[model samples]
Target chain A: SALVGVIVPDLSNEYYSESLQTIQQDLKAAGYQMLVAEANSVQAQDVVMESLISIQAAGIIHVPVVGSIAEGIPMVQLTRPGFPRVLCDDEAGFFQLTESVLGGSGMNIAALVGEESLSTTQERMRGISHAASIYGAEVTFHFGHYSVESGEEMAQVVFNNGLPDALIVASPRLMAGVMRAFTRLNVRVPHDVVIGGYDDPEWYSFVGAGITTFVPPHEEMGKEAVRLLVDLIENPETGDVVLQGQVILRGSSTH
Target chain B: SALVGVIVPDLSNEYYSESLQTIQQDLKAAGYQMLVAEANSVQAQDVVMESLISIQAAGIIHVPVAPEGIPMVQLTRGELGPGFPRVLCDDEAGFFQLTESVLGGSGMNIAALVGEESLSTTQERMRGISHAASIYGAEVTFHFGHYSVESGEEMAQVVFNNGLPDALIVASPRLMAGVMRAFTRLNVRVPHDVVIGGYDDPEWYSFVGAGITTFVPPHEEMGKEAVRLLVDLIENPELPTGDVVLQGQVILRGSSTH
Candidate 1:
């Protein structure tokens, strides 16, 4: 049976999990059986690679948890640096986030960004850093991996160092931990500290005064990845350019 | 290489989805390859068995006939000639304790919504609720339906149309979401207006409106137990088959408390 593998960071993150249903349909239509793997850690990525390689996949579509990719595997990397990659415009997303949060009463903003080694991280940092110089507001970034524990740990680092006027977070899972930290620390949300995060999960609306976050084109990014992979499988030397999907923080409606 | 297949009702249901993670880990350590699928219905399951491999799947709705030599450990279904090991949780006791926590008797009107009428879980859960309600002197009416949000919302609508019950017991979280939808639309709040009893406590249950009161089933334990049973049965053809029924914990939260 002809097979294709799709590797994600973990299932808890909706960004990867949600795209899977779409990818499954497209891959199935392209006459490829889909095998999904969760590379939760760096070494787990190797296990995933070996398994896929043993199965001799026709191609792979991956969201890299680590910075490197296997040389021989035909993969369209999603959300990281590699040929034929599907990248979200996180810089613009964070740029808007900084711009929105900057308009608030806070002078100092602390951001606990994901995997600073990745270009996505750099691009996101660049967006906020670029936006901050123009507004002359002080912004600090503490590098960490993305997960609920990282969210809490980042909170410990920031709150122990003394709270910033405002904080920026992304992902409901991450923000859930951040909110949990604030709740336990007896810091009222947006009163002692104002917080903003990225793209909507239904949980966002119910957390106290609700969350102000940006939206990412999750579905669009998934379709492009699948299309690119199928194209590469049919044609060998098919990749070089990057795909871009923008992010926007719309506070135009009720916050 | 011996490749094993595992199928469940739906991956959308976190109970089985979370269980799959545990199952995969165990298989990898035990020197076995694994494939997973979602058999959403009995008819769809017919198409599933035709697809591939030696597997571990519940009857889904009920055990559909399968290829010989493909060993299975029942998660929610029963009875077979091939002597498949069965691992189920105590749904009856769960419903009983939950009823006592959420009802505690004396003129409380309780309404229960559950999965397909044919499934043994639906029957057992209804029995427990009725027994508890009877001892508590609460009035209860049972509604049988499928395990989807749409069915749950429809059940809620039907119940409300007859008149609002003081409490509602839902069999599945997907179904619970539907009841929540119905309650949300009608502006009926929890505990103050009506209490909710839920099953298969998904983590998002806490963040759902007013936090759901649910019975946390041991899906992880059940999954591990199922894998152990199937692997032993596969390795030892002479092994005797039996049932492993686990107990679920009752969690009382905002949905049940005023």
Candidate 2:
């Protein structure tokens, strides 16, 4: 039987897990089985990719780890391109968030972004900086891991150095960690420091005054990646696909 | 390359995810590639198990969704005439520890929020809670829900409308989170208005000052042990089948005590 290889950075992240669910369903419908692997680092990703190639998978839908290079496979990338890619316009979402929070007032903003080497990080930074420049807000970048602990660690440093007016976290998992740190530090949210970020998890609604997040169409991205990969498998021609993201305003960003 | 299948009820649960990380590492060390699947229901488990059989998996390590008459086990028995070995978390310690905390306080009108009645974990938890209540002279009420934040909120809303209990013993972190949100929405303060107790996860610490009394199993240890047992079973089919039990720790926090 033919198989499709699906490699993701982390299964604990809802964005990746949810996407994997959809991709599995789509692939099964197309009469293909999926071999799913988690490669949390570039070295792990390289090993998994090699394994996929060894298995003679029809094609791969990859959510690459930072600094991973594609070799020996026909690949469809998610969020970054070493191959045909499916992406959410993260920059546009960050820009809209910056505009909303700034609202024509000069503010100090700190951003907790993913690895500096990832294209996704670069795009989001570009969007945030562009909007910050327009609004005359001072933006400081903090590069960190996508996990909750990393978020809390970076948040502690930022708070200790003197809290920024607002924080833009790159992922919901990190945002949750940052929120926990703020709570532990006795820093008032919205009143003391507002938080904005990407991909709102379901649990976020129940947390504190809620968080301001940009919800990417992950379901669409997953299905779209499957569609593109299936097409690429049939014929080796495909183009990069970008989807739009929506901003959700919550009490965390509104005092 | 041959694969070893690892099946769990849900990946969204932090406990399961953390365990899976350890399981993957252990399996890889033994030169076995792990194929993971989530069978959130009995029917799903059966289907995935059949798929594993079709792919001729070397072995399977399953966290059973419910007790006995598991469809996959039955199928394997009928087809291959040999029972496949399984590994599971020992839910007894965590439940016993959680129940002990609620029992410590007097005059408690307790509400226990649990998962589906069919699951062994739920059944074990009920036994622990019932045993503790029997000793502590506390009145207990039972509520059933799947493990999720939405179910927790719904259960909380129902509990609130019926009149708040002195303490709420929830089963999972997601449910505990939902209950907290319900408390927030209803303007009820934790410990002051009602005491909350449940399972613990890293995310639980995110709630500011809302300390939820709960318990945590040794998740990494469980995974490593499960892998060790599964590998042993695969290599030694003639070995006697047995269950491995691990201890769980209790976390006493301000939510249960003012």
Candidate 3:
């Protein structure tokens, strides 16, 4: 069987890899193959889109270019889907057929409400804020792009802003970066602030106290994408959005 | 809130650390605190349990010590009485109440099958078999303990009676102690008669060409499992037994067929 093409932000990151692995396993089980395309940065989003379109894959599953203004590409966004998408992290405020699939109560979230205009930043802010208000907890948000340096910068904001009781880091890569900042600044987890994050990470639980996170059932999502594509190929109108999420609890939470 | 306690096999493993990070974050958010007790070997299981008990934690979660009889005080069934509960991996049969909870597939079996067929002989025979077995799959069901020498001696007897396969594979520590005598007595040619087994070590793979097959879990299982288990322990304390078995893929090296 021809492979279903999958695109993501980066391969080195554990979240993306988890999505890839699950998609491949699910697809293989469903008797299809997968061609993975990794765009290391937001700029590469267009290239990935083009590749998938050219390959005429069964359909597409993407993290989507965080800042790309690409037009006319179909996606199942993991968190916030603008174009036939499925959102994974629930960071994006964009409401869809599925609402708040991954839910946690004992979350201490510090949104990186920094200076970047990345839609994910604002969307996550709103989503988390709503989640906080409903949960009766304060949501701490910082501003930054999906960069480690941004995370470090956010750390300063966190210190200046009086670290929230807990932090909800938005990006996997950025979360690691912020940890580096915490390490440099001599911040200890659970002592200074607890953390919850957007995506699942192998090192997430291993880091300073462990990072509580929302993990998308990437394998299930991947397989679902393949199923969606088959539906699309068989009949364009047959394809619909597929959504799923899993919450990864760690020591960073209510341990 | 008071600090909770966590006991793990080793903090060195990336998954353990990741779970620690998440748990700390969650606890902090919930207005609670935590402390970790890390044990590097099965020998420390008892000490870890004692520490958790002494701390008077609200709950306890652990990866537990490998090798069933390694020495856990076995929290006596329902010992916590509803306040503190024990969370363990899916190693115990019938422990996971759900069938879909098996995360890793027959890994030990895969390792054993692959190791028994590997051909690397530079190390001890039994340990080599252990490693090789792990490489093929860590879920293989060979009745053995922590001692590679014992495993090697037993494997030797199996070979002596059943004859050696095409190759052999074994975990290094086990191989270091048993390989020489097993091979000498069996008269097994390294690659011609049997190949070596390998898994999870980058340096191990780089140095040897025989016993090359290794098994690796889907990159996310380690992280995902950490998150799932921790969440289950915290949110649904009274939840029924659950286990997730995610089987890794076997990476075939020089010794297998090609």
Candidate 4:
């Protein structure tokens, strides 16, 4: 029996869920079937990968939850395996997602990150510097642990210290928490504080002043992984690193 | 290590994702770790359940994607060992979500528009409704469904045989596709011969009609309830199945016909 495997950090995350849906849809359209196993944590990568290998999956897709790419592990061995694999969203190296401030002034833009220590946080800060320079928005960034509590604290600090003209959140979870805090504080969005964030979720539009975000191409990422995996399965020498970009418009960014 | 296992039909489904996030947060707060497995198809429930049981998870939460419950119960009997626990949405026992036309209506300019055009003498008497008479006279109960391509075919067939609706209720991808096909089949103008009321995903809302009306819930409530209920079920595994019910808020946008 032919089977494909996907190992993701968590299926509960909207981004991951969307990706999974895309992968399933595309795979079915292409006449392939799969059995999925979600690791749900970065710590379980090795065990999860081993399980996939045990299943004899024709290909694999892994969204690593590793805190950093710096901590190399024996699991890295899987990358060189004859099976094809694709990594989505978080990249390990120095690459960053770039965004531009379309119309905001320098003093109005703020960047909210989950935590400085995580690899995603580090790369995003680097990207912010680049994005800030390009948009000429005076940008300030704060760190939170990607939890609602962290987001609330960060929002309090931003509101009391000095709310920027517009805000950008790095993680979807944090973005929602921060927005709630803003609402509790009675700060109106766009009218009082223009908001933007990373990780475009469908719920973002339903919120007040829909959150503007640099949406990741989640569906495309899923489809691309399967395509690459097919190639790698057919020819071991065909493995390639996939890079996906982002879009800057949504409910939050419009006004 | 201790682990809680969640078996959802598809993580890719936004509703499942939202539920998963809530469950994860609640489990984390309660100091329990969780492992999730997606049985993308209902047919794979047996395999998925067996895999979770093999890991010796403390509990399992499932959202049955398939219509029939007998097979799921049978699978559980075969795969789940003695004393292993399970939590399920009420749908398994054929419980319908209690909803009211009032819950669906009486809000926004659109619902008010529907109530206004309605024929009930006591209807347009409300603050929001202006066209109650016209709307109530039409004798058709409006309904909505999750959006998908399959809905388009269903709508096409319905419209081809039955006369086009004066005001159609559309929700979800398939429903919209179905409505579109129905309209095309009958050559009816949207928001004209058939006014469409639906939920806007924001991604493709603009693609529909600028004046399209929709219903949306206040964000976070669903996520919060999902967390709250999952935690309650996890903490009190022996609780009765009928004890919990979560509510969703209704929001209205676009398309109104009176």
Model 2 ranges off by over 4 Å: A66-74, B40-56, B64-85, B206-209, B238-241
Number of clashes found in candidate 3: 124
Q: iRMS of each prediction in angstroms?
A: 3.8, 2.6, 20.8, 8.2
At residue A91, candidate 1 shows an lDDT of 83
Clashing pairs in 1: none
Q: What's the TM-score of candidate 3 when only chain A is evaluated?
A: 0.71
lDDT for each candidate structure? 0.71, 0.75, 0.48, 0.50
Chain A TM-score values for every predicted structure, listed in order: 0.86, 0.92, 0.71, 0.77
Task: Please name the candidate that would achieve the greatest DockQ relative to the true structure.
Answer: 2
Model 2, position A144: C-alpha lDDT score: 90
TM-scores of the candidates are: 0.82, 0.90, 0.44, 0.57
Ranked candidates, highest DockQ first: 2, 1, 4, 3
lDDT of 2 by residue, A90-150 (tens): 8898889877667555789999998898778899999999989988898999999888899
Give the clash total for candidate 2. 0
| Alpha carbon RMSD to native, model 4 | 10.2
lDDT tens digits by residue: candidate 4, B1-258: 245556666565544555555655665666645555567465566666655544445555565442221112111112232223232222111101111221234332222112122422113122122233234332334322233545455654555466554445443433554555445445656555545555423333322333445544322444444444445555664653232323333333334443
Candidates ranked by lDDT: 2, 1, 4, 3
In the order shown, the candidates' DockQ scores are 0.20, 0.49, 0.01, 0.19
Candidate 4 wrongly placed segments (more than 4 Å):
A28-32, A40-43, A67-108, A134-136, A238-251, B1-7, B14-142, B147-258
Each predicted model: what fraction of the native A–B Cα contacts (within 8 Å) does it retain? 0.00, 0.37, 0.00, 0.35
lDDT for A151 in candidate 3 is 74
B-chain TM-score of model 3: 0.46
